[PDB]
């Protein structure tokens with residue numbers, strides 16, 4: 001991690017909250033816009049370890065689909081984690097505000113990118129545990145950067161992580177399946193109005209999310225295999241990336257759509 005001097009950072013507006021300090025939009029010195037998470041006076045030992053630990057792992061990550069760390073302020077207070085700024089913001093809100101505005105190839109391409117970042121994290125032995133559209137940022141090239149803003153996301157979490165806290169790359173794959181469904185539905189809420197308990201019961205009873213509208217059959221098949229109850233039967237991120245890459249590079253493959261199950265009948 002590069003150490004940034006405080007005089008090179010200007011905090012402008014609050015954009016969120018952190019573990020113990022706000023998150024700001026600002027500028028980094030010609031000037032590059034940035035996101036800034038602070039650790040404010042009074043932070044605890046554990047908070048400092050988690051903060052500087054977070055900064056450390058982020059500085060290790062160098063991938064096109066992982067949020068880029070610009071630097072850290074650790075020598076002065078407040079301490080700071082400073083990343084690139086993504087003007088299109090988080091993917092979930094982005095898609096819901098742009099309903100229907102993209103091609104199927106653009107949507108699958110977003111997913112290929114998310115998958116590539118997740119393969120990198122899994123290969124680096126980093127378990128995300130909170131993969132969801134809300135933690136993915138979009139840049140002005142439509143490139144998706146995996147991030148983590150903090151919080152329990154029952155609807156995004158694999159049964160074994162819920163039941164007995166077994167978080168692994170394979171539970172991240174389940175979450176990726178949900179992200180796949182979020183993308184192809186333009187940010188619909190998974191399981192709609194079902195309660196957290198109703199979701200767990202449906203999944204244990206064997207039900208799975210239905211196909212999104214206008215969704216390539218191959219894409220629905222892939223997200224369904226991310227939701228295997230048996231962790232060992234789920235694809236690895238390497239499998240996911242490879243399938244998405246072959247689909248994009250042979251785009252007629254996406255023209256075959258899964259049947260959509262109408263929830264309403266209109267007869268004319």
Ligand SMILES: Cc1ccc(C(=O)Nc2cccc(C#N)c2)cc1Nc1nc(-c2cccnc2)nc2c1cnn2C
Pocket residue numbers: 015016017023034035036037054058066067081082083084085086087089090121137146147148149
């Ligand atoms: C500054 C910063 C610090 C940490 C992280 C982060 O992803 N940490 C991390 C830890 C562990 C694993 C992985 C991974 N893989 C990633 C991200 C950012 N940056 C952003 N965060 C927020 C934001 C908004 C509201 C509340 N909290 C945060 N909005 C942003 C940006 C950039 N642009 N915008 C619009």
